[PDB]
């Protein structure tokens, strides 16, 4: 059916126009880059001074904090919080043979953009909404935890102690159980959906003038790869500055009534990850060469395996 | 007593304002029949006089502006705001001469210009109380009010309100600044979103908002306003940004029709040069990949790649980059207040630097407004897949479709009753013969048509109350998944709910579940196992308990459900068998799941012989006392369940090339199914003599039909096969020659049913074993 | 029974016939004195066709007996206009209807 | 606490307390290895609420068999009237909702606290107990004439108790939907006592707080419940809370009910008096 | 009769028991093994 | 599916359906399905109609009629799609294509076919006839 494909000049104009708006969108509008994330945050932050009332960036984060603590069984998806969280994430992603003076001026610039966000109380805002998520790995934890790293980037110390006293004056269990439910609902190298992907990849073009939407299904095996590295990078940078009271708090919560001990569930996920890559090796132990599909999925599994290796060593690098 | 004495009464002030809110809440949410009956109590002359009367008290003035929009301007306002999100622009010549900037790079006024997006009219009806009352009413429209005099009055009291706010009087209209500006602004906002205001009128609203920026007295934004007035102005400026977005989408679609008229003319001229080109052979197919071989979607993606392999010359590739830098300069990107985005952004922050906003409705509406102005290109890309383009010869039926889809979304906000059900049937009954539903399948999916039908199936399924409503909706989604294949993929996401409520007469949501996975190998191979364990647990329920509908009607007691479980077995043939080739992943997981539960099979194989069960099935079907005593018969449903059980075990069998390999999985499955069902039981069933129709007609729901033997020969051809000759001539003698001489004598519905049985099932078997 | 009592005199020669439009600027009332309809608050005159059963029976047998420019007062009995169920929300059941009809132009 | 894994056992019997979803507990001589129960402390706001559940149930079971002592015997054990009044007056002050001018971080913790202790009160009684002391007290519709079966002091305090009994019932189904779902089967228990003329502000606020929290009551209302509410408004003056319950009867959760929207238009409106 | 139930009953007030020692003085001391005591329900007012 | 047909057969089929529809319901009898196909040139004998109603009560609605014409048109088009698909392979058109011509024009058609798949394709089958190429494609 490739050869009976109709050309464009025999196609009608209205269906030729809808293929133009979709093609101009994917080639020109998606590829265009703009840096409006910096300029909006600095003008709301210089809006604190005018001719002790809350600043407009401070007004926004307590509005994001109050809509977290209302009693509801689940959290609603808010497009406005997802859209403001990645603006605050890329506002600090600008600074994240070189000399000595230039690297510290990149560092004190980055701790300035993190000072511009977290003195308004954004460090407690991210922890309220992992607490109110209750184990649902929706689109919103991808937006708040990428904000949670960019505030905690580089081993900053005043952001961590502002997080630690907040979980000690509240003493509310539900932040640590949510990391536990977010950890066990991560995907590994499955060997059941991998042959389903290999059989469906052979259909290069579907009949009656259809290009197969490869981005809709994506990769069935290790589809949740970014977030389970985005979660473990957040847990690595929590104890990056060798702070001893965090690794005693994450191990045993003596203030709360129920201890969770993330460090055991870290080993439980990596033991689950060990047997998946080992069984992925035993499936490919008889074949000679590996195709581009297998080395894609193996480097996907080994990169998250290095992140949990970096998450585990910073838990034990402190004395 | 005068209505102006209630400002000192303060008791019947409270009663009449509480009566007026009852006058609003009764005729609310699109109930026009009471809204005409309320028009007798509150006259239009006494309601338009109360708009400009400044001596009226506070809450009484605020309720009268809310009353008139509740009785006249809400059924038409809700329909167009629901239609303002999607963009349907036809290729009329009014569209082809539109630019982003007005000719005379200075940005024009928002809301001023020409638009061609199709939106349904408001459909007003004049009120009358002396007409003859008929007799079910078909539909009753919103009551008509003259909008030509109401719009000039609405601009006059707003024009007086902004001018009286500069003098700073001690006694404003209503007693406070909130009661002066909020009821006039929300009424100016609602007649603007319905769309009666002319171009000169909207130039006057922008001069009253800000006379410095919008010029082609003190402005309304520079004045100090309380938080209630600030919230109604964000809804006013959300309109102008949506109109600025709609003008930007129509200019992008106007440029597209001006481009592809030049694009298809260039490429056919390049093909006419290529067919006269005999100077190369290896490069001749390299130029012809896009022209004949590549699909027409991949041509547009490959031809528009000239930024930073494109056969377009230098004449027709700069005009799009001339359009591209014109579009980003129309947005907030510089690409190197006096504009709308610079006015709104400095206003939201100045409202935020004034004092702490304690109202959460405004501060979210403030930051959602500020995010829309800076992220302008992101707002366009998220709104463009809901933007379509049709031919101008289809506008007479497309607005007939949007008037009827607006009927359903106006019926979604009210709970279903005995009369709103039949309006839903006639509405979906008109969408399926409007001829636009079939030629453009990608636009029905963009309008939210399939979502509006499923939420009415959510609210009714939750026993069922309206069975006529639920069958017409699932029938609509069954025929929706066969117009195009991507219409079926948006339904595959909903299968966890569509299969949970499958376990009544007519169509059932399992038919939507069956139509979502039929004839498409992509959705069949991407099906999870979690949707498959629900079907076999529903099938394990039919083996121990019987039908609740049968024993309540008076049927004899039988320990299992044949007709109920047959609906789950014919569902699973569609998953394990796609386009005549059996999948291996879904067949491996359905055989693994069925054999752990012995109740999913029949009680004979769970142990009597299978022919002995079907010979007992003829015994109950021939006898009138043992049979059902009306269309469902017990004696036919038992073999219909077994033939659905047998051919399911046939279509999940592996093909011959998996047995030819060294796969230990394929001969394991064939060893289970050969040892699950014996051979000589099937040799007897295929040899069963049937009642031949000759000189009288039998009943098909009360006799043996040859569709059961077609299940047995397909399972015998697939898990057993024919290898030798004594097995070959035995089943050929005893099984098909009483079938074929019976068809030779009928040279009648059984004559046509067994003739389809021969040429579909046995004659492909004989040609398989022909050498 | 329709009791036509005149209020202002008219022409006395032009009367409505079948298949002909009329414009009537009425205002209807109940027996108690409460107004339920008026066509002059809207400033839009009511127009109807005689004989095609648009209006109630008491209205057309009331409008047929008048002249051009005449203004009369009818008292429609509840048997001829909304007897049992009535019109819900406007007129109570078994209520007497009073109309002050005035024929402006065209018979 | 929880680190002992210790069983309960008798000092003289010497019998293990093991199992037999609802498994009866029995002292078995065989015992089992799954009897290692761990002790967890409760909180302090639950232990106080549980004892005043018992302190009120011990008084009000005695109030009912005191009131049924003279239910069928005419008068030609002294009942604790002074104990029944102040215990209700502290129970209404115990369930009184927080102020609106309070901080939102503190308002939400007191509101979620209050809902658990009105759910904990209703599960162990304290509601069917409350309807039965009311349905034994409403049969004497008069304040001093028909209340002569008890005495003069109970007849003068006949009026005050039902005012506190209905204000607590208006306090117990205020806001929580799980207690408002109990009043679906006995709606006519609330509707038929609107024109009782004894604490008529009491039943109206009970019907108001039960029709703004649960939408399942709004679709079981036929026309006789509606006609009693216009009959409520036509004999108890021009009241504004009778209009607000009619405003709450039309729509619910943003969804209109036209089974109830038309019966107001054909009963309240065309009379015009 | 005494039963077993799940987590919805466990947050309710029916599954609360209170321990009292035999002897009068120093009732709030820490309990040890080999100690006789009584089981009290706080809602029904009954002794196990 | 129903996307195999263009707009212009579907607008023609609603033109034929609404012309002989009973009351605008979208209904026809078991006679009128015969007269609505002979009004457009297509003249089937009564066995071709006899199976399609058994395929779909006596009420033939417009989605039922649209699916029956789609199957009536696709079977002849799926039998004839492959000859015009064979026409760019040979220069004259009788069905005779060179073996040296077929390894640059079949590796470049846009289904991401490598040099290995067409090498497997032609040596599981000088110049080869046209009817063998259907024999070697459908397999």
Q: Which of D11, D14, D27 to mutate to test the interface with E (most CBs of E within 10 A)?
A: D11
Alpha-carbon span B642 to B711, nearest angstrom: 9
Nearest-angstrom CA–CA distance, C14 and C20: 12
> Can you tell me which residue has the tokens 């139930």?
E5
Q: Does F116 touch chain A (CB under 8 A)?
A: no
Residues A156 and A114 sit within 8 Å (Cβ to Cβ): yes
Integer angstrom CA distances of residue A167 from A134, A259, A266, B24? 16, 13, 21, 48
Least CB-CB distance to B129: which of C41, C43, C90? C90
d(CA B414, CA B420): 9
Report the residue of chain A nearest F86, measured CA to CA: A3
Would you tell me how many other CB atoms lie within 10 Å of the CB of residue E40? 15
Please check whether residue B30 is in contact with residue B78, taking contact to mean a CB–CB distance below 8 angstroms. Answer: yes
Give break positions in chain D: residue before each, C–N beyond 2.5 Å: 20, 76
Contact criterion met (CB below 8 Å) for B374 and B238: no
Measured at the alpha carbon of residue D234, what is the angle toward residues D232 and D239, in degrees to the nearest 5? 75
Q: Are strands B387-390 and B87-90 parallel, antiparallel or unpaired?
A: parallel
Is C48 catalytic? The answer is: no
DSSP-based three-state secondary structure for E9? helix
Residues with Cβ within 8 Å of residue B725, at least 6 apart in sequence: none
Which residue bears the tokens 């001229």?
A: B269
Q: Name residues whose C-beta falls within 8 Å of residue B736's C-beta, 6 or more positions apart in sequence.
A: B686, B758, B762
d(CA D220, CA D210): 13
**Residues flagged as binding site of A:** 240, 314
Side-chain-side CA neighbours of residue D22 (13 Å): 4
Q: How far apart are CA A294 and CA A174, in angstroms?
A: 38
Q: Answer for the pair D227, D267: CB distance below 8 angstroms, yes or no.
A: yes
Q: CB–CB of A71/D114 below 8 Å?
A: no
To test the contact with chain A by mutation, choose from B271, B364, B390 the residue with the greatest count of A C-beta atoms within 10 A, namely B364
CB contacts of A26 in chain B (<8 Å) are 301
Nearest Cα of chain B lies from the Cα of C14 at a distance, in angstroms, of 24
At D28 the three-state DSSP class reads strand
Place of tokens 């569930």: A265
CA dihedral B400, B402, B403, B407 (to 10 degrees): 140
B527: three-class secondary structure by DSSP: coil
Dist. CA A148–CA A118, nearest whole Å: 11
Please answer whether residues A53 and B421 qualify as being in contact, where contact means their C-beta atoms are separated by less than 8 angstroms.
no
Residues in chain C: 107
- Three-class SS of residue B685? helix
Question: What does residue C22 show for φ and ψ, rounded to 5 degrees?
Answer: -135, 150
d(CA E17, CA E40): 5
Contact between C87 and B133 under an 8 Å Cβ cutoff? The reply is yes
Residue C26: active-site member: yes
DSSP, residue by residue, B718-765? III---SSHHHHHHHHHHHHHHHHHHHHT--HHHHHHHHHIIIIIHHH
| DSSP state letters, B299-363 | HHHHHT---------TTSSHHHHHHHHHHHHHTT------SHHHHHHHHHHHHHTTS----HHHH
Considering C15, C36, C46, C48, which one is annotated as catalytic?
C36
Buried b (16+ CB within 10 A) or exposed e, D179-212: bbebbeeebeebbebbeeebbbebbbbbbbbbbb
Q: Are C27 and C39 in contact (CB under 8 A)?
A: yes
The β-bridge partners of C98 are: C29, C75
- Residues of chain B neighbouring A43 (CB-CB closer than 8 A): 349
Binding-site residues of A for Ca(2+): 240, 314
Q: Which residue has the tokens 């065309």?
A: D270
- Backbone torsions φ then ψ of D163, nearest 5 degrees: -70, -35
Distance CA B572, CA B644 (A): 10
| Residues facing residue D251 across a β-bridge | D256
C-alpha distances in angstroms, B662 versus A289, B584, B674? Answer: 21, 15, 19
Label each residue of chain C as H, E or C: CEEEEEEECCCCCCCCCCCCEEEECCEEEECCCCEEEECCCCCCCEEEECCCCCECHHHHHHHCCCCCCCEEEEEECCCCCCCCCCCCCCCCCCCCEEECCEECCCC
Which residue, chain included where needed, has tokens 């000399």? A99
From chain B, the residues in CB contact with A67 under 8 A are 360
Alpha carbon distance A128, A124 (integer Å): 6
Instruction: Indicate if C100 belongs to the active site.
Output: no
Decide if A183 contacts A231 (C-beta within 8 A).
yes
Contact D31, D13 (CB under 8 A): no
* Mutation choice for D interface testing from E2, E11, E13 by most D CBs within 10 A: E13
C-alpha distances in angstroms, D106 versus A48, D98, D99, D109, D111? Answer: 27, 10, 10, 5, 9
Pairwise CA distance, residues B575 & B594, whole Å = 14
Question: Which pair of tokens denotes residue B568?
Answer: 């789950």
- Calpha distance D68→F136 (Å, rounded): 98
Does the beta-carbon distance from A20 to B300 stay under 8 Å? yes
Residues of D in contact with C86 (CB under 8 A): 270
Residue F48: enclosing H or E segment and its boundaries? helix F46-55
Per the residue annotation, which of C50, C82, C91, C98 is the catalytic one?
C82
CB contact under 8 A, B417 and D256: no
**Peptide-bond breaks in chain A following residues (C–N over 2.5 A):** 51, 96
| Closest-CA residue to B53 (of B142, B153, B144, B122) | B153
Cα B740 from Cα D16, distance rounded (Å) = 78
d(CA B652, CA B669): 9
Query: Quick one: angle between helices B360-374 and B376-383, nearest 10?
Result: 90
Helix axes B44-52, B147-164, angle to 10 degrees: 20
| Alpha-carbon gap, residue B287 to B283, rounded angstroms | 6
Helix (H, G, I), strand (E, B) or coil at D16: strand
Whether residue A4 lies within 8 A of chain F, CB to CB, comes out as yes
Q: What is the CA radius of gyration of chain F?
A: 21
SS3 A40: helix
Choosing from C26, C50, C59, C98, the catalytic residue is C26
What are the φ/ψ torsions at residue A192 (nearest 5 degrees)?
-110, -45
Q: Judge whether C37 counts as a catalytic residue.
A: yes
Instruction: Enumerate neighbours of F (3 or more CB pairs within 8 A).
Output: A, B
Known catalytic residue at C99: yes
d(CA B28, CA B59): 19
CA distance B286 to A134: 56
Q: Which residues of B694-707 are buried (b: 16+ CB within 10 A; e: fewer)?
A: eeeeeeeeebbbbb
Among C52, C73, C49, smallest CA distance to C62 is for: C73
Beta carbon pairs, A and D, within 8 Å? 7
**Contacting subunits of B (3+ beta carbon pairs below 8 A):** A, C, D, F
Could you give the residue ranges of the DSSP H alpha helices within B413-508? 420-431, 436-439, 441-446, 449-461, 467-480, 485-492, 495-498
Hey, are the CB atoms on B40 and C54 less than 8 Å from each other?
no
CB distance B641 to B569 below 8 Å = yes
The answer to whether the CB of B2 falls within 8 A of the CB of B8 is no
Q: Render B151-204 in DSSP notation, one character per residue.
A: HHHHHHHHHHHHHHTTTT-SS-TTSSHHHHHHHHHHHHHHHHHHT---HHHHHH
CB B254 within 8 A of CB A17: no
- List the beta strands (DSSP E) in chain D: 16-18, 26-28, 251-252, 255-256
Cβ-proximal residues to A306 (8 Å cutoff; 6+ apart), any chain = none
Q: Single out the residue of B463, B361, B448 nearest to residue B412, CA to CA.
A: B448
Chain D residues touching C88 at Cβ < 8 A = 262, 265-266, 270
Do residues D27 and D13 touch, judged by C-beta distance below 8 A? Answer: yes
Taking the mean position of all CA atoms in its chain, how far away is CA F60?
Answer: 23
For residue B322, give every residue at least 6 positions away whose Cβ sits within 8 Å of its Cβ, in sequence order, or none: none
Q: Comparing C-alpha atoms, which of C40, C55, C47 is closest to residue C21?
A: C47
User: Residue B578: helix, strand or coil by DSSP?
Assistant: strand
> Which of A71, A128, A166 is the mutation pick for testing D, counting most D CBs within 10 A?
A71
Q: Helix or strand or coil: residue B241?
A: helix
Q: Read off the tokens for A46.
A: 């210089």
What are residue B390's phi and psi, to 5 degrees?
-115, 170
Distance CA D46, CA D197 (A): 38
Chains C and A touch (3+ CB pairs under 8 A): no
Q: Which residues contact A110 (CB under 8 A, 6 or more apart)?
A: A92, A95, A96, A153, A154
Minimal CA–CA distance to C96: which of C58, C63, C61? C58
CA distance A248 to A244: 7
With a CB cutoff of 8 Å and minimum separation 6, the contacts of A250 are A176, A238, A239, A261, A262, A263, A315
CA B638 centroid distance within chain = 38
Contact A154, A107 (CB under 8 A): yes
- Positive or negative torsion for Cα B236, B241, B242, B247: positive
Long-range contacts of E24-31 (CB under 8 A, 24+ apart): none
The angle formed by the CA atoms of residues B225, B227 and B228, to the nearest 5 degrees, is 100
- Please give the Cα distance from C36 to C30 (Å, whole number): 7
Is the distance from CB of B117 to CB of B135 less than 8 angstroms? no
One-character DSSP codes across B620-681: HHHSTTTS------HHHHHHHHHHHHHHHHHHTS--HHHHTTT-TTHHHHHHHHHHHS-SHH
**Burial readout A106-132 (b: 16 or more C-beta within 10 A, e: otherwise):** eeeebbebbebbbebbbbbbbbbbbbb
Main-chain phi, psi angles of A18, to 5 degrees: -70, -30
The CA distance from A301 to A280, in Å, is 10
User: With contacts defined as CB-CB under 8 Å, which chain A residues touch B332?
Assistant: 36
Q: Are F62 and F26 in contact (CB under 8 A)?
A: yes
Angle made by CA atoms B99, B104, B109, in degrees to the nearest 5: 60
Q: Among all residues of chain E, which has the CA nearest to that of D22?
A: E4
Instruction: State whether C88 and D266 contact (CB < 8 Å).
Output: yes
| A100-108: long-range contacts, CB 8 A cutoff, minimum separation 24 | A107/A154
Give φ, ψ of E37 to 5 degrees.
-155, 175
Closest CA to B89 of B367, B341, B297, B390: B390
> Chains that contact E by 3+ CB pairs under 8 Å?
D
Residue B350 contacts by C-beta under 8 Å, 6 or more apart in sequence? none
Residue D236 structure tokens: 């108890």
Neighbours of E3 (CB within 10 A): 14
Q: Which residues of B touch C37 (CB under 8 A)?
A: 40, 129-130
The CA distance from B174 to B54, in Å, is 7
User: In CATH, which of 3.10.50.40, 3.40.50.300, 3.30.300.100, 3.30.1480.10 is domain C1-107?
Assistant: 3.10.50.40
The technique by which this structure was obtained is cryo-EM
DSSP, collapsed to helix, strand or coil, labels residue D162 as helix
The two tokens of residue B721 are 């096969």
Question: Would residue C11 show up in a list of annotated catalytic residues for this protein?
Answer: no
* CA atoms of C58 and C79, how far apart (whole Å): 9
């Amino acid at each position: 059916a490739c050869f009976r494909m109709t050309p464009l000049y025999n196609l009608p104009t209205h269906r030729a126009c809808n293929m133009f708006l979709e093609s101009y969108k994917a080639a020109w509008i998606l590829t265009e880059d703009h840096s409006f994330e910096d300029r909006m945050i600095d003008d709301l932050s210089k809006a604190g001074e005018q001719e002790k009332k809350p600043d407009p960036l401070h007004q926004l984060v307590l509005h994001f904090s109050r809509t977290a603590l209302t009693e509801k069984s689940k959290l609603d998806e808010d497009y406005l919080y997802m859209a403001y969280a990645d603006i605050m994430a890329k506002s600090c992603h600008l600074e994240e043979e070189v000399s000595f003076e230039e690297k510290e001026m990149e560092k004190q610039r980055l701790l300035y953009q993190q000072s511009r966000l977290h003195t308004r109380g954004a460090a407690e805002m991210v922890l309220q909404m992992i607490s109110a998520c209750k184990g649902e790995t929706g689109a919103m934890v991808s937006s708040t935890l990428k904000l949670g790293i960019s505030i905690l980037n580089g081993g900053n110390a005043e952001v961590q102690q502002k997080m630690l006293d907040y979980l000690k004056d509240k003493k509310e269990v539900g932040f640590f159980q949510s990391i536990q439910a977010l950890m066990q609902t991560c995907s590994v190298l499955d060997l059941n959906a991998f042959e389903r992907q290999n059989k469906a990849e052979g259909l290069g073009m579907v009949n009656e003038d259809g290009t197969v939407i490869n981005r809709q299904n994506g990769e069935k095996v290790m589809a949740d790869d970014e977030f389970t590295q985005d979660l473990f990078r957040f847990l690595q940078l929590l104890c990056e500055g060798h702070n001893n009271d965090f690794q005693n708090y994450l191990r045993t919560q003596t203030g709360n009534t129920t201890t969770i001990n993330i460090i055991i569930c870290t080993v439980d996920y990596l033991l689950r990850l060990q047997e998946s890559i080992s069984d992925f090796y035993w499936y490919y132990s008889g074949k000679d060469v590996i195709e581009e599909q297998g080395k894609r999925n193996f480097s996907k599994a080994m990169s998250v395996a290095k992140q949990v290796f970096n998450s585990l060593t910073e838990y034990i690098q402190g004395p | 007593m005068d209505i102006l004495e209630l400002s000192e009464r303060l008791d019947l002030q409270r009663f009449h304002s509480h009566t007026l809110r009852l006058y609003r809440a009764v005729c609310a949410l699109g109930n026009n029949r009471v809204a005409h009956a309320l028009c007798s109590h509150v006259d239009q002359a006494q309601l338009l006089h109360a708009l400009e009367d400044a001596h009226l008290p506070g809450p009484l003035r605020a309720g009268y502006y809310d009353l008139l929009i509740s009785i006249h301007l809400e059924s038409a306002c809700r329909s167009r705001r629901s239609m303002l999100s999607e963009y349907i622009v036809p290729l009329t010549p009014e569209t082809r001469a539109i630019t982003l900037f007005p000719p005379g790079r200075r940005h024009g006024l928002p809301g001023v210009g020409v638009t061609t997006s199709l939106r349904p009219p408001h459909h007003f009806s004049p009120p009358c109380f002396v007409a003859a009352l008929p007799a079910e009413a078909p539909a009753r429209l919103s009551p008509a009010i003259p909008l030509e005099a109401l719009r000039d009055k609405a601009l006059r009291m707003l024009g007086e309100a902004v001018r009286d706010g500069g003098q700073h009087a001690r006694d404003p209209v209503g007693g406070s600044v909130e009661f002066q500006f909020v009821p006039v602004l929300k009424l100016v906002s609602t007649l603007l979103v319905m769309g009666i205001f002319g171009d000169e009128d909207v130039k006057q609203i922008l001069k009253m908002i800000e006379p410095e920026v919008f010029t082609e007295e003190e402005g309304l934004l520079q004045m100090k306003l309380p938080e209630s007035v600030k919230l109604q102005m964000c809804n006013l400026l959300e309109y102008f940004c949506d109109q600025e977005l709609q003008h930007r989408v129509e200019s992008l679609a106007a440029f597209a029709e001006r481009y592809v008229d030049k694009l298809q003319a260039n490429q056919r001229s390049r093909y006419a040069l290529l067919m006269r080109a005999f100077t190369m052979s290896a490069a001749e197919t390299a130029r012809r990949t896009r022209e004949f071989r590549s699909p027409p979607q991949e041509q547009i993606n490959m031809l528009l790649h000239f930024k930073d392999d494109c056969p377009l010359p230098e004449d027709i590739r700069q005009d799009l980059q001339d359009f591209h830098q014109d579009l980003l300069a129309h947005c907030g990107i510089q690409l190197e207040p006096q504009s709308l985005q610079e006015l709104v952004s400095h206003m939201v922050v100045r409202w935020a630097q004034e004092d702490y906003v304690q109202s959460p409705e405004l501060v979210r509406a403030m930051f959602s407004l500020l995010h829309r102005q800076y992220d302008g290109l992101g707002e366009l890309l998220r709104a463009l897949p809901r933007a379509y383009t049709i031919s101008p010869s289809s506008v007479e039926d497309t607005m007939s479709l949007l008037e009827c889809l607006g009927q359903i979304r106006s019926l979604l906000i009210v709970q279903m009753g005995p009369q709103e059900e039949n309006l839903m049937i006639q509405s979906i009954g008109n969408i399926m013969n409007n001829k636009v539903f079939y030629q453009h399948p990608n636009l029905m999916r963009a309008l939210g048509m399939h979502e509006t039908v499923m939420e009415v199936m959510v609210n009714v399924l939750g026993e069922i109350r309206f069975p006529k409503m639920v069958t017409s909706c699932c029938r609509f989604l069954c025929y929706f998944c066969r117009i195009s294949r991507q219409n079926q993929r948006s339904m595959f996401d909903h299968l966890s709910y569509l299969l949970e409520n499958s376990g009544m007469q007519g169509s059932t949501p399992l038919d939507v579940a069956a139509a979502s996975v039929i004839d498409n190998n992509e959705l069949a191979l991407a099906l999870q196992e979690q949707d498959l364990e629900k079907v076999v647990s529903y099938l394990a329920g039919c083996g121990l308990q019987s039908c609740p509908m049968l024993l309540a009607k008076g049927y004899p007691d039988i320990g299992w459900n044949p007709c109920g479980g047959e609906r789950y077995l014919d569902f699973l043939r569609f998953a394990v068998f796609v386009n005549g080739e059996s999948v291996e992943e879904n067949a491996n997981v359905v055989v693994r799941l069925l054999i752990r539960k012995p109740e999913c099979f029949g009680p004979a194989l769970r142990g009597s012989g299978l022919l002995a069960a079907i010979e007992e099935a003829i015994r109950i079907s021939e006898d009138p006392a043992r049979d059902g005593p009306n269309r469902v018969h017990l004696g036919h449903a038992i073999m219909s369940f077994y033939a659905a059980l047998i051919d399911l075990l046939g279509r999940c069998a592996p093909e011959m090339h998996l047995i030819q390999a060294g796969k230990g999985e394929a001969l394991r499955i064939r060893a289970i199914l050969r040892s699950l069902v014996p051979l000589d039981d099937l040799v007897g069933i295929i040899s069963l003599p049937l009642q031949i129709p000759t000189l009288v007609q039998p009943k098909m729901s009360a006799s043996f039909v040859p569709d059961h033997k077609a299940s047995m020969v397909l399972f015998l051809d697939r898990v057993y096969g024919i290898e030798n000759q004594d097995f070959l001539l035995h089943v050929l003698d005893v099984g098909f020659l009483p079938d074929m001489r019976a068809a030779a004598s009928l040279d009648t519905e059984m004559a046509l049913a067994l003739n389809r049985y021969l040429c579909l099932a046995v004659l492909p078997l004989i040609t398989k074993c022909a050498p | 029974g329709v009791e036509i009592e005149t209020i202002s005199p008219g022409d006395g020669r032009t009367f409505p016939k079948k298949g002909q439009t009329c414009v009537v600027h009425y205002t209807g009332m109940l027996q108690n004195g409460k107004k339920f309809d008026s066509s002059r608050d809207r400033n839009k005159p009511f127009k109807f066709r005689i004989g095609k059963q648009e209006v109630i029976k008491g209205f057309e047998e009331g409008a047929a007996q008048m002249s051009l420019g005449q203004r009369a007062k009818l008292t429609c009995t509840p048997d001829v206009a909304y007897g049992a169920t009535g019109h819900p929300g406007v007129i109570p059941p078994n209520a007497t209807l009073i109309f002050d009809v005035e024929l402006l132009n065209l018979e | 606490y929880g680190e002992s894994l210790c069983f309960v056992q008798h000092v003289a019997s010497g019998l293990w307390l093991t199992y037999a979803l609802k498994k009866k507990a029995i002292l078995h001589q065989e015992g089992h290895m799954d009897d290692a129960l761990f002790l967890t402390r409760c909180q302090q706001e639950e232990s106080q609420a549980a004892r005043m559940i018992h302190s009120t149930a011990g008084l009000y079971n005695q109030f009912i068999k005191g009131l049924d002592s003279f239910s069928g015997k005419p008068r030609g054990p002294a009942l604790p009237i002074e104990a029944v009044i102040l215990s209700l007056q502290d129970l209404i002050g115990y369930f009184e909702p927080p102020s609106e001018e309070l901080q939102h971080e503190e308002k939400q913790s007191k509101l979620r606290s209050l809902r658990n202790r009105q759910s904990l009160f209703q599960e162990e009684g304290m509601l069917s107990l409350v309807l039965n002391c009311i349905d034994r007290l409403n049969v004497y519709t008069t304040a001093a004439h028909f209340a002569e079966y008890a005495g003069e002091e109970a007849a003068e305090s006949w009026k005050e108790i039902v005012n506190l009994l209905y204000e607590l019932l208006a306090s117990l189904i205020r806001g929580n939907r799980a207690n408002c779902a109990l009043f679906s089967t006995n709606l006519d228990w609330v509707v038929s006592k609107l024109d009782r003329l004894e604490a008529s502000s009491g039943i109206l606020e009970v019907l108001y707080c039960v029709l703004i929290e649960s939408p399942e009551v709004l679709n079981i209302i036929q026309e006789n419940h509606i006609k009693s509410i216009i009959s409520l408004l036509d004999k108890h003056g021009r009241n504004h809370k009778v209009l607000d319950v009619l405003c709450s009867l039309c729509v619910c959760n943003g969804v209109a009910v036209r089974s109830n929207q038309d019966l107001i238009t054909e009963n309240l409106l065309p009379g015009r008096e | 009769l005494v039963y077993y139930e799940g987590g919805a009953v466990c947050t309710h007030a029916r599954s609360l028991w209170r321990l009292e020692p035999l002897r009068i003085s120093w009732s709030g001391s820490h309990l040890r093994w080999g100690q006789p005591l009584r089981i009290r329900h706080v809602t029904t007012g009954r002794y196990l | 599916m129903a996307d195999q047909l263009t707009e212009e057969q579907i607008a023609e089929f609603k033109e034929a359906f609404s012309l002989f529809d009973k009351d605008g319901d979208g209904t026809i009898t078991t006679k009128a399905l015969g007269t609505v196909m002979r009004s457009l040139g297509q003249n089937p004998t009564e066995a071709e109609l006899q199976d399609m109603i058994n395929e779909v009560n006596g009420t033939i609605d417009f989605p039922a009629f649209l699916t029956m014409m789609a199957r009536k048109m696709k079977d002849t088009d799926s039998e004839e799609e492959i000859r015009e698909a064979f026409r760019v392979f040979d220069k004259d058109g009788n069905g005779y294509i060179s073996a040296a011509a077929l390894r640059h024009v079949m590796t470049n058609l846009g289904e991401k076919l490598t040099d290995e798949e067409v090498d497997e394709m032609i040596r599981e089958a000088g110049q080869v006839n046209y009817e063998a190429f259907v024999q070697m494609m459908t397999a």
